[PDB]
Amino acid sequence: DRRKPPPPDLPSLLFDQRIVYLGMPLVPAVTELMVAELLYLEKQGATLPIEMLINSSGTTRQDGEILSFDSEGVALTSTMGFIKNPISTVNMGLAVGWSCVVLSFGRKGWRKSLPHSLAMIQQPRVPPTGQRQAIEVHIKWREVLDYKRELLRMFSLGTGLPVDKLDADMQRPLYMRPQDALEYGIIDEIIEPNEDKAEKAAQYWIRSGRAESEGRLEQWQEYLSLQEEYALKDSFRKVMTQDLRAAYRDTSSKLLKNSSRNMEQVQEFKERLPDDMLTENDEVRLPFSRDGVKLAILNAECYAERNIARQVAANKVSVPDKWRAAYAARPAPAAPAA
Amino acid sequence: ATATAAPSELDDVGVSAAAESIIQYAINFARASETYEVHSWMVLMGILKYETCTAAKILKSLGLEDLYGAWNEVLWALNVCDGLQPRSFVTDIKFADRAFKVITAASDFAVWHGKDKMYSEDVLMALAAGGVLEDLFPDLNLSFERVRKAVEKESGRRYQLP
Amino acid sequence: PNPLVIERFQGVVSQLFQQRIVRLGGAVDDDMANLLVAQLLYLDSVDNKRDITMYVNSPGGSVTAGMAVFDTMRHIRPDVSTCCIGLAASMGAFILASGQAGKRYSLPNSRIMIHQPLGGAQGQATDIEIQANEILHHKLTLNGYLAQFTGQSMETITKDTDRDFFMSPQEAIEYGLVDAIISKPQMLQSREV
Amino acid sequence: PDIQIGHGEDAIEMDLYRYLLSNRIIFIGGYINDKMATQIVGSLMALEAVDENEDIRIYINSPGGQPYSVLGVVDAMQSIKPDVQTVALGACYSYASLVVAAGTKGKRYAMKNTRLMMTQPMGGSQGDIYQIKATVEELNALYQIFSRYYMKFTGMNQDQIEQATCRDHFMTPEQAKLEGLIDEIIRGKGDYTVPPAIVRQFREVGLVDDLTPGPFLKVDCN
Amino acid sequence: CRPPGQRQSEWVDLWEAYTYQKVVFIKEAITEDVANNMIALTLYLDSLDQKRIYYWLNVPGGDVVPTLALYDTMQYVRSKTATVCYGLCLGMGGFLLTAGGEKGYRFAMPHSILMMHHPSGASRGQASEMHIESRELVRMRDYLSLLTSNATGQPYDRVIRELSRNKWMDPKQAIEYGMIDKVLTTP
Amino acid sequence: SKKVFMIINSFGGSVGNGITVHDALQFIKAGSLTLALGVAASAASLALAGGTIGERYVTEGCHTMIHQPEGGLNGQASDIWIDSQEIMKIRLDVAEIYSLSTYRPRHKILRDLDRDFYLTAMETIYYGLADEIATNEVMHSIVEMTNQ
Amino acid sequence: KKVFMIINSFGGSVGNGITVHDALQFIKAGSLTLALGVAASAASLALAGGTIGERYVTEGCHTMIHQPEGGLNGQASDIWIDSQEIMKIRLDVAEIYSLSTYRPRHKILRDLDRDFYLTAMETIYYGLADEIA
Amino acid sequence: YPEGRPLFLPEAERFGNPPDLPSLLLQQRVIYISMPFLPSVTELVVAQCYYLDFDDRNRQRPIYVYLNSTGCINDKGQAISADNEFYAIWAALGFTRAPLYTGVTWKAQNQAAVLLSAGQKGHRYSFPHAKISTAPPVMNRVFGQAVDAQLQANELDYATKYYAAILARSTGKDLETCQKQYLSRKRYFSVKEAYEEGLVDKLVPGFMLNRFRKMQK
Amino acid sequence: PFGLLLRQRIVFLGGEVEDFGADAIISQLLLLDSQDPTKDIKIFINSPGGSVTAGMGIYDAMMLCRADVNTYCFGLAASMGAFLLGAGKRGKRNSMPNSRIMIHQPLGGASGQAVDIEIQAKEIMYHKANLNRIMADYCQQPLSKIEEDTDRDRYMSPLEAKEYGLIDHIIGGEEAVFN
């Protein structure tokens, strides 16, 4: 055991356990180091696994300042394709751009992430050309297009999703929490915190009497009261909206039109009857709101201070002082004022 | 094992036409409103939609005369109490905790009920054991055990559970 | 630039202004918009009936200063007929859109670019929400106005202006941004065939 | 490509802004620093000397101002004889915002698409504890002065100003007319488009929902 | 080109490892700094013993006084000198390529690019100061031209007329011109 | 040493780094004793709240300032909007982490992250970010553990 | 025993590419050259410099080929001389490509004219690389 | 693998002298604070303290703290760092066991003056031309509402009361008195004025001037 | 517009006061005096400070004028505009209801050999004494109180200053004086 001394520092200490730590913006020096370490770890054995930790912001700073190119990521990802022993990639903190592809490019079922880490994917950008000709602008765009397509193909191998969907999603920043990355295809697992730690934490909070009396109960009560009050306020807003729609239907039941016959005509032969189409053309029905709930009792509140209206009838001829050049608006049998 | 939450266990598993149609309609409704996650109320809407199915006919005998009205009441509750909030685009329609438990319970019922297939009456008992019937029509006093007896009378075969 | 160029251009600017032709050139910052509001108010005071012709040739400009010019155009009495020459881009394009309906023109070889506001949010999370609401309000307002001018729909506009959307004046007419192309007849070259 | 002026073209052909000031119009652009405040007060007093009874019209398109210069300008506006009539254009960002509220009540205007703003007096502490106490007292005195002026012009409560100034508060002409900062909105030839904030205020009172948003801008993507 | 290459028993830097074998890689344009380092290295290498010093040059140019100092140090040492041209030898580098081993020990790689030009310089001041500087620079042109002519075997007057502008050569032109002696190939 | 002692004195750092250190400290099996000397700003407050509950020490003269994530961002209206929504999600992540570390409701934490928020030793222990005043005997024993 | 050159270089001066090509050919045991991601001009020369039969490119890699660049400054005759050498450089680079691709040198000169991009398969077909990883 | 234990002077006298100077001073239990209280100095001093109270057998060998720093405030009077760097140093120097002797070489100013006073009574040294000075704490320029500046004033008043507490314990005076005399305005002390007020206690041991030595020869 | 106001014997002193700015104002006051000796001048002060040399130049010009020179501060008058505002004729100094008045010492420095440093300290101390002596006379307050107040960094409302003796009238009738 003396013959191999203790490792001189921390990178040697980690890399000695086959942990390739990618934690820096993917610059040419970082890419070269990653390639050298992956090739060396295949050399020491191509069955032993490699645990790659990814806390990196891709080829550009999160500020947006381009700092390498779209081909350092292609090198690293094609390297990970070249090495044949299993790679488990754990996402720590940030995995942006190509550093997200690398996260999704590990061995499937072994890609993981910490519970709060963020995996962003966007579309590559390039530094300003500097007023080149026309053909050189076309050629630069073809370069950028080929590298974007490479990013898309590698991200399709990673996630599992078509190229077109990924292209559409990439056009703007796409931020993914581990639940979202797990949904999308980036990762497979989430590294839950240690259970014994959490259990001991809860027990300490209970037993010490800190969770009960340090001011906690008063403001937890305040929190629940605010939640209930705001839920009730939103329910009242929904009630207001539904009553407005009911008023529109009350004042729209006085109609004489032949356009409904046209709407019967346009629809298909199968839907000659009212037969909806299981789509976002979805008619929610308010009128069958005969809840009849005898349990939800009105609280001790007094609405008897509301006045007594004039009790107007709509079956009059008087009209509001408006302007309309249409003379098809005949008075209705129920609306002589129309 | 959570492999029961699989499309095979919906298609490959021997189910009646009624239960399969109910679940497929619930999935169609989860996809339609763009909220790719089936709730237990969407399953109940599947039952109420098929008025011809014996499950919905057992509800008629238990006091739900207005079955179209009951379907619309449930949809209105879903819009208000719950939420038909359209989400983004999930490639695979998911299943809520209550709804997946209702699927497992319906198959477990069928086992103890002798039916080699999974039936709609079993789904209705699964909904009742999850409150869903009493969570929506407390006026009709329609609880898990009342429909337990209703379906016992309907099929005339005693059922027993662990 | 050269002072003699500035003096010649200020002289021809005075001549054009005499002929009731204001002009919007260069990035529309606050200074240019204050100047152009002043010119429009003067031209309203001089005569309340004759048309004003507004020369748009701009690569961009501030949303706020552009809206100062736009409200003054829509408030004054004379009809401000906007004409585009060279490049109406991203706020001169909005200004060109907002010229008197039926009186927005463009020479045949011009480019119209309409897109959404740029900008920046800086500071703590709440300051970034406030500033993102300012930028999103400007985007929604400008898209609503483009829908009003062009006859398109708000969603078609919002889809079309997500990124830079360059258009020839022919495509602009077919869109609704411009109403006519200004050009004189040429001699149709006979081909041997 | 700095700027190019008309002339108005009378027998003299003077600068356009000199012509407009002669016809009693003062333009406020850019930050109200000490030079801008001096120029505006000098213009107000020259116009007063020419005719002490006829209206002065002030166009305000400015991204702020030094607070002391703005207080000087508002004091000069309130201390002159003619009616001062302030039209807001483009932006009026918080200190300029008071300049809009300081027009003769009934004659404060804003163009349909301006962006008013209200903010607490922002300053900045640095150095010894006594310099920081001096900064605290300066910013408290400025908060009191501007809060009292906003109360004076809009009639709001000091509580209401506390909510309306706790953070950068961007307002359309419609909130400004509801609050009292301006008196009339200068619209187009029949332009009544509802801005996104007012649409949200519709949604908060239940007038429109997600199902039936009405003919208003889609704010379902917020 | 950083990694230390292993030596007799330990890890030693690549360029130090080379100089352990008398090989002196010159890779930067000759400024005061690089010239001092290479003069020092030459003197110490001659101090260890006297076998021979191979100079592998990739010089893209340089300043005149430091290059002449390096040349005089190469000529002062007891051990002979051979100069190989990996990459390219421009200007004063092309003059160093004609500074070691007149007897057929200047080599070049097949695609090496060779260039010679009259030494540059710039200096101002009084009138008389410019006289002194101009006379010194003309002395420098003449000295470097004498050295070039006696290295390559071309007439002095020919060299003066040729090098007034830039002069570029492929290794075949350099053999034919006398600038070098052999071209390295796979052997 | 079946404990990892982590000594805190740092005036800031991006909050994402504080989240990373918090997650790592909550992930490793071994316990953690986090000591604050002088100050613990945003990321350092996350790292201080991240230790084993009951062994988050803070000296008498320490201050703990927690502030909401601050970001900067340029681009088109949609890009500003998307980055805005992400920064709000980070603010909620941080509020929830403090809520779970201190047992205060997320709404009182969010109310406090509204503005830069300084806490003394008693204020920090009362609030819940730390658990014990660091007296000399504490890391007397800490050094002795590292030595024993 | 064989120099195994991993190449990923977005750019570089072409003359340095020639120098690395010469250094590669100098050693007698063959050289393997594996390109990752990108191999631009100064590295495209290096990639073409490996042992024919042992030059590999990866599915994602793209090859750049272009003529050399240069800035000149001086009198008219200095400009003429300097133009003549840049032309000599371009002719040499075309010759190296001709040796590696076995394609008409004039055609290679025509393809050098502007920036030239090759996918991995087009790199194989052109002749700069031999196999795909 | 094996736990490599740092061995200390009683048993490390057989391993020779350390290579460079800072290792020498660390071995002599001298912590030379020559540079203003930046986060770097704080980190280095915390690590030195952690190493010194790590394995001292008797931990009565005093720790020397020589100062040549103007504390947390730049030469032109505007804060270069914050007061929390001082707290971290001070706190660290307290978690050891040994008596803490302090000395001034040339300047101990504005925070280093407090840390100077905070040594052992009877064991605070200075060079006879050291300049000592006490100034109120200073914050650096930050922007905001009146509330932000009020928060900074509160923080600075905590810092001022902290320094006044240490100076009261050191100079043996009334707490508010020590606040008024030292921290209220930037005041200068020669070595004699500082000794008069309890800032320092002695010159460095063995300090003997040159012509004085001459005349005793 | 400033031409018409200069015809009306109104002089504006706005923004930072500097050497050239002083020379211009000095000349305007001399012109207004040599033209008309019986009609008052009005000087408006909105200035955040200035140079002590230039400020004392303008003050000398103001004190030379036969025609009584009123001053009317608006917005700011900081430590050198405030002194000049206090140097108007007694009973004819005015301020806006919400102007901010600051009284404070000057800054300075020196460098190199400390002979010039002691000379600069002596000159800054002279400026202190000179300004304070005349400030005490017109504020009608004890020189000790003025010396103490000119030390303290602070703004004051025109109500506080009107009490303190600096200004004499507030234009607005103290109806818009806000704290």
Query: Can you give the length of chain H in residues?
Result: 217
**Residue A21: CA count within 13 A, CB half-sphere:** 10
Tell me the count of D-I CB pairs closer than 8 A: 100
Quote the CA–CA distance of D1 and C32 in Å, as a whole number: 10
SS3 content of chain F, % helix, strand, coil (to 5): 50, 25, 25
CA dist F73 → A66, C120, F94 (Å):
15, 6, 20
Given CB atoms, is H129 within the 8 Å cutoff of chain D?
Answer: no
In the residue annotation, G13 being an active-site residue is answered as: no
Catalytic option among C90, C98, C106, C110: C90
- What are the sequence ranges of the domains in chain H? 9-216
Q: Tell me how close the Cα of C14 comes to any Cα of chain D, in angstroms.
A: 5
Q: What is the resolution of this structure in A?
A: 3.3
Report the CATH architecture of H9-216.
Alpha-Beta Complex (3.90)
Contact partners, residue I55, CB within 8 Å, separation at least 6: I17, I22, I80, I83, I84
Residue B160 covered by a domain: no
Q: Tell me how close the Cα of C112 comes to any Cα of chain D, in angstroms.
A: 21
How many whole angstroms from its chain centre is CA H95? 15
Catalytic option among I47, I95, I99, I104: I104
Chains within contact range of chain B (3+ C-beta pairs < 8 Å):
A
Q: Where are the alpha helices (DSSP H) in chain D?
A: 16-22, 34-50, 67-78, 95-101, 129-154, 158-165, 173-179, 196-204
Q: Where are the alpha helices (DSSP H) in C19-124?
A: 30-46, 63-75, 92-97
Q: Tell me how far apart the 2 most distant CA atoms of chain D are, in Å.
A: 64
Number of domains in chain B: 1
Q: Experimental method used, please?
A: cryo-EM
Quick count: other Cβ atoms within 10 Å of Cβ F76? 20
CA dist D83 → A20, D48, D80 (Å):
76, 10, 8
Q: Which residue of F has its CA nearest to A194?
A: F27
Quote the CA–CA distance of H27 and H52 in Å, as a whole number: 9
Q: Which residue of F has its CA nearest to A54?
A: F20
Contact partners, residue I171, CB within 8 Å, separation at least 6: D75, D79, I72, I94, I95, I96, I97
Using a CB-CB cut-off of 8 Å, the residues of chain G touching E58 are 19
**CB within 8 Å of chain H, chain F residues 20-79:** 37-39, 59, 61-63
Catalytic option among G41, G83, G98, G100: G41
Interchain proximity A219–F108, CB inside 8 Å: yes
DSSP 8-class letter at E133: H
Residue D213 covered by a domain: no
Quote the CA–CA distance of I85 and I96 in Å, as a whole number: 12
Range H27-30, long-range pairs (CB < 8 A, 24+ positions) = H28/H64, H29/H61, H29/H62, H29/H63, H29/H64, H29/H98, H30/H63, H30/H64, H30/H65, H30/H66
Which among E6, E41, E11, E13 has a CA at the least distance from the CA of E26? Answer: E41
Quote the CA–CA distance of A262 and A175 in Å, as a whole number: 47
Quote the CA–CA distance of B154 and B149 in Å, as a whole number: 8
Chain H touches chain B, with at least 3 Cβ pairs below 8 Å, answer no
Residue B113 covered by a domain: yes
Parallel/antiparallel/unpaired status of strands E113-116 and E167-169: antiparallel
Residue with tokens 């071995």: H27
Residue B161 covered by a domain: no
Chains within contact range of chain H (3+ C-beta pairs < 8 Å):
A, D, F
Collapse the DSSP code of F16 into the 3-class scheme (helix H, G, I; strand E, B; otherwise coil) and give the result. helix
Collapse the DSSP code of H23 into the 3-class scheme (helix H, G, I; strand E, B; otherwise coil) and give the result. helix
DSSP 8-class letter at H13: G
β-pair partners for I11: I43
Q: Tell me how close the Cα of A283 comes to any Cα of chain H, in angstroms.
A: 51
Please, what is the end-to-end C-alpha distance for chain I in angstroms? 33
Domain span including residue B55? 2-155
Tell me the count of F-H CB pairs closer than 8 A: 60
- What are the sequence ranges of the domains in chain E? 1-187
- Give residue D38's region: left, alpha or beta (phi > 0; psi -120 to 50): alpha
Contact partners, residue H138, CB within 8 Å, separation at least 6: D127, D128, H72, H73, H77, H78, H79, H156
Interchain proximity A1–H4, CB inside 8 Å: no
CA dist A18 → A86, C180, C189, D1 (Å):
11, 70, 76, 62
List the single residue in E112, E166, E170 with the smallest CB-CB distance to G81: E166
Interchain proximity G36–A79, CB inside 8 Å: yes
Catalytic option among G31, G44, G66, G100: G66
Using a CB-CB cut-off of 8 Å, the residues of chain D touching C68 are 61, 89-90, 111, 114
List the single residue in D42, D68, D144 with the smallest CB-CB distance to I2: D42
Interchain proximity F37–H88, CB inside 8 Å: yes
Tell me the count of C-D CB pairs closer than 8 A: 120
> Please, what is the angle between helix A163-170 and helix A134-158, to 10°?
120
Interchain proximity C64–D20, CB inside 8 Å: no
What's the angle, vertex CA I135, arms to CA I78 and CA I76, rounded to 5?
Answer: 15
Quote the CA–CA distance of H167 and I164 in Å, as a whole number: 40
Q: Tell me how close the Cα of G36 comes to any Cα of chain A, in angstroms.
A: 5
Identify the H or E element spanning A182. helix A178-184
Q: Tell me how far apart the 2 most distant CA atoms of chain H are, in Å.
A: 69
**Selected residue of A24, A214, A218 to mutate for chain F interface (largest F Cβ count, 10 A):** A214
CA dist H9 → A74, G108, H17 (Å):
55, 74, 10
Q: Tell me how close the Cα of H120 comes to any Cα of chain D, in angstroms.
A: 30
Which residues of F does the annotation mark as catalytic? 42, 67
Tokens of E111: 């695609």
Quote the CA–CA distance of E110 and E184 in Å, as a whole number: 7
Using a CB-CB cut-off of 8 Å, the residues of chain H touching A6 are 1-2, 4
Sign of the alpha-carbon torsion through H198, H199, H204, H208: negative
Assigned superfamily of I1-170: 2-enoyl-CoA Hydratase; Chain A, domain 1 (3.90.226.10)
Quote the CA–CA distance of F54 and I48 in Å, as a whole number: 56
CA dist C62 → C72, D32, E150 (Å):
15, 19, 72
Domain span including residue D160? 16-205
Q: Tell me how close the Cα of A98 comes to any Cα of chain D, in angstroms.
A: 29
Query: Can you give the length of chain D in residues?
Result: 222
Which among E16, E24, E185 has a CA at the least distance from the CA of E100? Answer: E24
Q: Which residue of H has its CA nearest to F7?
A: H46
Catalytic option among I47, I79, I99, I157: I79
Quote the CA–CA distance of B159 and B8 in Å, as a whole number: 27
Quote the CA–CA distance of H159 and G53 in Å, as a whole number: 74
Chains within contact range of chain C (3+ C-beta pairs < 8 Å):
D, F
- What are the sequence ranges of the domains in chain I? 1-170
Contact partners, residue C95, CB within 8 Å, separation at least 6: C24, C28, C54, C56, C58, C66, C69, C70, C73, C82, C88
Chain H touches chain A, with at least 3 Cβ pairs below 8 Å, answer yes
**CB within 8 Å of chain B, chain A residues 87-126:** none
The CATH number linked to B24 is 1.10.1780.10
Residue D216 covered by a domain: no
- What are the sequence ranges of the domains in chain C? 1-193
Identify the H or E element spanning I57. helix I52-64
Given CB atoms, is H142 within the 8 Å cutoff of chain D?
Answer: yes
Is I135 in contact with I146 (CB distance < 8 Å)? yes
Contact partners, residue C176, CB within 8 Å, separation at least 6: C149, C150, C151, C152
CA dist B140 → A289, B59, B65, B66, B137 (Å):
15, 10, 11, 12, 6
Tokens of H24: 């020498």
In the residue annotation, C81 being an active-site residue is answered as: no
Given CB atoms, is H48 within the 8 Å cutoff of chain F?
Answer: no
Interchain proximity H39–F11, CB inside 8 Å: yes
